Amino acid sequence: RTVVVERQISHPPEKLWRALTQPHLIEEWLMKNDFKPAVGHRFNISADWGGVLDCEVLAVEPNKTLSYTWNLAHQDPAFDLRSVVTFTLTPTPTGTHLRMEQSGFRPDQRRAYGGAKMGWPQFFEKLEQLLD
């Protein structure tokens, strides 16, 4: 299954791009992370309570495309997530159109699938609030 979220952002691509690629900015709308805009770069996204995700930068195309894995190794197949998250920025007259595609959810992971459709909209809201 794939979770897709799209939104029209009222800011230029460069400004959105920074909020998507700078650690301290990502942390504002997302959470703690050691992200770096370099293909092959491995990093983690974690929460203050201990939860953590394992990621690797897959593709980087300044102001246009950003993709990285978003996984968690777990003995329980229901929580053993392997996915790809890809941001696609499309410049428009008023700002930038942003699409997020997260792929890889298995039928036995409704929890992760559902949590993604619920959480991304919130993550986006915090991102827009940040840019505003």
Work out how close the CB of 126 gets to a copy of itself at its nearest, in angstroms, rounded to a whole number: 12
Cβ distance to a copy of itself smaller for residue 40 or 73: 73
| 52 Cβ contact partners less than 8 Å away, ≥ 6 residues apart | 44, 45, 46, 72
Token output for 30: 């997302």
Give the C-alpha separation, 120 to 117, whole Å. 6
Q: Which residues bind a copy of itself (CB under 8 A)?
A: 32, 44-53, 70, 72-76, 79, 81, 83, 111-112, 114-116, 118-119, 122-123
Query: Which one, 79 or 129, has the nearer CB to a copy of itself?
Result: 79
* Minimal distance, residue 70 CB to a copy of itself, in Å: 7
CB of 86 to a copy of itself, least distance (A): 16
115 token code pair: 């949590």
Looking at the Cβ atoms of 3 and 57, the one nearer to a copy of itself is: 3
- 3-state DSSP: the chain helix, strand, coil percent, rounded to 5? 30, 35, 35
Write down the residue that tokens 């410049």 correspond to: 91
